[PDB]
């Protein structure tokens, strides 16, 4: 996260770190959506151009974390994966359309002050909150700069959703309805973006109707980090909800 701030303790209790077992390193963000299911970006797990194709055994899920690098004894919970599910129409060849995946945990994670699931939006949630100018929140342990540092603690940044024509005019990538973009314009004088290592984490909003947090997006891609006139792009969770529902009721908790 570029130009964000340190999270508060327990600020984003659905935050999940995807951690590579060997070498030991941060692979991506992710979010906790139930006691056995975790949501992330497909390209965190499968991305042929970079020779990335992780299997269940290659990673761990770390939940309830704050510090990036420390083993947060008695606070964080480390979970093994039972099975990974990538969207069958994920488009890794061109534009990361449908950049979404689920991971089922081998065992249920116990909730605590630091570990709690985020809500997934229903159609009305999305219609009312996903509007240009409404701000969401992005969180992650990714890079602090496009090129250099790395954070000590979870970072947070609030960013406005951008009009679809402005998103489209900022990029040469083909944008689909499964994506949305967020960030400030040059004239707005505020900054912030996701960066390398933030992919898969959540873009969340707090409904003013029911006071609950909903995960509207997944950090997917961006042309650099926090560049003027560029914006971050997020998977549109509500548009892919039928797919989410289908894999959880066919296979899960």
């Amino acid at each position: 996260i570029v130009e964000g701030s340190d999270a508060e303790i327990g600020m984003s209790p659905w935050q999940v770190m995807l951690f590579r077992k060997s070498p030991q390193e941060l692979l991506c963000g992710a979010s906790l959506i139930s006691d056995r299911w975790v949501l992330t970006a497909a390209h965190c797990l499968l991305y042929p151009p970079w020779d990335k194709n992780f299997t269940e055994n290659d990673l761990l899920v770390r939940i309830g974390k704050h510090s990036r690098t420390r083993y947060e004894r008695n606070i964080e919970k480390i979970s093994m994966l039972e099975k990974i599910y990538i969207h069958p129409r994920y488009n890794w060849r061109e534009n990361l359309d449908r950049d979404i995946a689920l991971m089922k945990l081998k065992k249920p994670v116990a909730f605590s002050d630091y570990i709690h699931p985020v809500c997934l939006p229903d159609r009305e949630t999305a219609a009312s909150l996903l509007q240009a100018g409404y701000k969401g929140r992005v969180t992650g342990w990714g890079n602090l700069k496009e090129t250099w540092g790395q954070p000590s603690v979870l970072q947070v940044v609030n960013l406005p959703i951008v009009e679809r024509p402005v998103c489209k005019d900022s990029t040469r990538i083909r944008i689909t309805d499964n994506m949305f973009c967020a960030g400030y314009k040059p004239d707005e004088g505020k900054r912030g973006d996701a960066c390398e290592g933030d992919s898969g984490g959540p873009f969340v909003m707090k409904s003013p109707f029911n006071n609950r947090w909903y995960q509207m997006g997944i950090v997917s891609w961006g042309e650099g980090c926090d560049r003027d006139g560029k914006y971050g792009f997020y998977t549109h969770v509500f548009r892919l909800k039928k797919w989410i529902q289908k894999v959880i009721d066919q296979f899960g908790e």
Partner: peptide, 27 residues
Amino acid sequence: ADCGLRPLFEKKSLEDKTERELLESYI
């Protein structure tokens, strides 16, 4: 169920330091 309600914030009626920025952007 209890999704989206944080134990250290909504459950105790405490706000975090920037959620008000979000809620001021909603309409």
